[PDB]
Design goal:
This is part of a larger assembly, with 2 copies of chain A. Chain A is an alpha+beta fold. Chain A has 9 helices and 9 strands. Bound molecules: fe (iii) ion (FE) (2 copies).
Chain lengths: 278, 269
Amino acid sequence: AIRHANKATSSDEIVQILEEDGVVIVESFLSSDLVQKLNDELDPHLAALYDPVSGESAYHPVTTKQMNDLPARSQTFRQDLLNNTLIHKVCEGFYGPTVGDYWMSHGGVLERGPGTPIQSLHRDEAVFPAIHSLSGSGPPVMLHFFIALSDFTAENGATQFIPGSHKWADFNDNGTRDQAVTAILKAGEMVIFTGKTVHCGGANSTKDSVRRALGMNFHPWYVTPYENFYNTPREVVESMTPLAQRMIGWRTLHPHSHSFGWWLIRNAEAGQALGLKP
Amino acid sequence: AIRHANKATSSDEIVQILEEDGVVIVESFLSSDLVQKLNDELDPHLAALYHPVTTKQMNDLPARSQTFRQDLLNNTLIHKVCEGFYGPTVGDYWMSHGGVLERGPGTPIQSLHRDEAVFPAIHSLSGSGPPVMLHFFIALSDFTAENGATQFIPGSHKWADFNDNGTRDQAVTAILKAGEMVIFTGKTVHCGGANSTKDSVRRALGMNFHPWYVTPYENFYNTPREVVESMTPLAQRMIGWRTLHPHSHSFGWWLIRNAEAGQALGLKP
Ligand SMILES: [Fe+3]
Ligand SMILES: [Fe+3]
């Protein structure tokens, strides 16, 4: 009951489906070559965090991996995803008039292989109780772009959603499990959802298949990003476009409310104060 | 100067350069992907290592890095060079020390020193001494004269009096890209450079090998058994978990009850 219908569809209708249902499925979002390039850049970094041989150390049953600080690690994430026209058109439409500017809070590759337990139904914006307590009347905060780096089946745990749960008057009700619809995704096939939408990841019943995803969680300008990107090497930041630099917090935000800017250095543009080109 | 040699140069020729000069440079000995795997595996444990300090280390690598456990400890070129360096009378060898070295801005220049100085009985024999230390110095980052690339004095390994450490103008800098290696003897005069640059850390991976009869500096018995059992028997011998087979005492050395030690401690034959 999640409408995909997102190839010839305009983004304004994508924003409309996001407003009505709280979740939308974008078909054919990433080219299969883009998925292969992303998986190739991402594999070494993941393999180097998780050594299969371990002398107990932390622990052996590894049903789950995930990784962030993507801009330092992946060029294709650095350029293609952070500058993607559809992500930004949907971001501008979702935040709308009163917000104005936005930046990325969290960019992560998530992997759950065989034996992964099913998740509880929840809302990510529960991490901000002052916003969460307003329930469905609250302002837009989190926007989540979930790219499928592998097939997304009900059998390896396709993520489930409850459409319309972003409008509920009481967010202490996370709904029930018979209200959840699974999101089947094949190649790039992104799914977009709000931080107010009830959802849960599925169980990986398979003995053999690993679910892999790339989550891009965006914030309005006034909400603190989860990730700090200042240890990113300066040459990597200087290779990025100013839009992508603003996404990772190296440029000032421009809310229309406070038109003169936010996240400034001596009331001046920040990245320019620390060596980036104007 | 120092002689670069790789690609079509066979390890027999690198051993010959090592005998004549005491130092040699193997170009692009590690692939950039291998350097990337090494830096990724080493960065988290370098960050957790404990006035800002400019000198930084790590050892007990086999417990810490898979790429060192498998690729580096089993590298064919290093073992060919080891067999050629110790030669017939020795027979067997093992690694004494495996370390990551990090020196960034503010690193003072080092004195010319000859590492085998830690062994007065061998060091007193000067250039007539037996081969003891073999140092494989892999570049995990660029080595520039700007960031303090190590300097060497070619031929200083065969001098008749090791109380003479030479002087600074006899030293040749070893310029390396990431992944390039420099091999040198424990009898060769050398010194690290000063890193004047305010923004750049120089990082290296040194593997110091010994003949079978010289005690390794590193003790690897606290290494968890699961990583040791994941290693090849050659790599296990490199870290002291298997007995050596010197040509001198062919029955074996470093045994448990006159039997092979690794089998004696629960390892597979
Ligand atoms: Fe969630
Ligand atoms: Fe030295």
